[PDB]
């Protein structure tokens, strides 16, 4: 159970560039490649990658040409180039997951006992990261149908040690927007988080509407989860929560008030100093 996975900027940009290749080459709408990283502890570090000639037909969905021979050739080839790199997963440039994915993941697991799939969204977004991490786990459907091979989500994020940081932030600085303004940045974080939550609930509402209209079958599990969420919603007008809220907000405002005093006093000191210095200077020019 690989709880945590960290992708790296190099693999991200490489996937982007390869997808751009394929876009120029033809119209495939999705692309696949292999992901190399050192599975340090139960936390994977997907730290390099390379594409694999892949294809499929829009209709059958059982047709594709993932080249395992090519795969092995260059897995060994990159092993030769560097040693601490033995396959850990595979990436695909699919805006959404596909059925093909389970079979492809089994194929890759043939090489990696615990392989990790990742979806990289070359198409942009504004809510979360451009990556998603999935693992082919099998769970028993407590009721009804037998167990099936289904993908499962794992905590995926992004990092770089120092060198990738230098390169990425350099290119950013070249073409970017304002850096961390502390207050500004973290308020922007608040608003961005609100936007993401809103988009997610838009999505869940849309699905619920589809089900209510009957465009898809009722999934008692998804229901269970939804009413769990609602059951988990809190109560604010509890008359204890509110008293505590006011009390601690009072403490927060007290500290902010004193800090404001600090700011005001220092600014006033600065004003006194500047005024007296300027007066003495102009007196000098007078004499």
């Amino acid at each position: 159970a690989v709880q945590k996975v960290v992708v790296h900027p190099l693999v991200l940009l490489s996937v982007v560039d390869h997808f751009n290749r394929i876009g120029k080459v033809g119209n495939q709408k999705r692309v696949v490649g292999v992901l190399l990283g050192s599975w340090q502890k139960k936390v994977l570090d997907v730290s390099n990658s390379f594409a694999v000639p892949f294809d499929e037909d829009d209709k059958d969905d059982s047709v594709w040409f993932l080249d395992h021979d090519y795969l092995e050739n260059m897995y060994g080839m990159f092993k030769k180039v560097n040693a601490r790199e033995r396959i850990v997963g595979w990436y695909h440039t699919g805006p959404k997951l596909h059925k093909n994915d389970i079979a492809i993941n089994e194929l890759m697991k043939r090489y990696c006992p615990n392989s990790v799939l990742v979806i990289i969204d070359v198409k942009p977004k504004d809510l979360g990261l451009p990556t998603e991490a999935y693992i082919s786990v099998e769970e028993v459907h407590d009721d009804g149908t037998p167990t099936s091979k289904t993908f499962e989500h794992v905590t995926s994020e992004i990092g770089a040690e120092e060198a990738e940081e230098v390169g990425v932030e350099h290119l950013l600085r070249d073409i970017k927007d304002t850096t961390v303004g502390t207050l500004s940045q973290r308020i922007t974080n608040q608003v961005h988080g609100l936007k993401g939550l809103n988009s997610k609930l838009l999505d869940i509402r849309s699905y619920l509407e589809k089900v209510a209209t009957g465009k898809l079958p009722i999934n008692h599990q998804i229901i269970y989860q939804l009413q769990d969420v609602f059951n988990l919603l809190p109560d604010v007008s509890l008359q204890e929560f509110v008293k505590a809220f006011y009390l601690k907000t009072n403490d927060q405002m007290v500290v902010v008030y004193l800090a404001s005093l600090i700011r005001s006093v220092v600014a006033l000191h600065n004003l006194i100093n500047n005024k007296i210095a300027n007066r003495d200077a102009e007196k000098k020019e007078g004499q």
Binding site: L183, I187, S237, V242, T249
Partner: protein, 44 residues
């Protein structure tokens, strides 16, 4: 008749009733703190 003078309620026993006797002000407090940040932040 003076019960014309709003007659209070006369309670149960003509007690003339009596002297008659939450909601986190979230939005307004948010406005206040946003304003604090704004003032802290302008170049001025």
């Amino acid at each position: 008749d003076y019960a014309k003078k709003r007659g209070w309620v006369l309670g149960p026993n003509n007690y003339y009733s009596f002297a008659s006797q939450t909601t986190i002000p979230s939005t307004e407090l948010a406005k206040q703190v946003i304003e604090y940040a704004r003032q802290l932040e302008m170049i001025v």
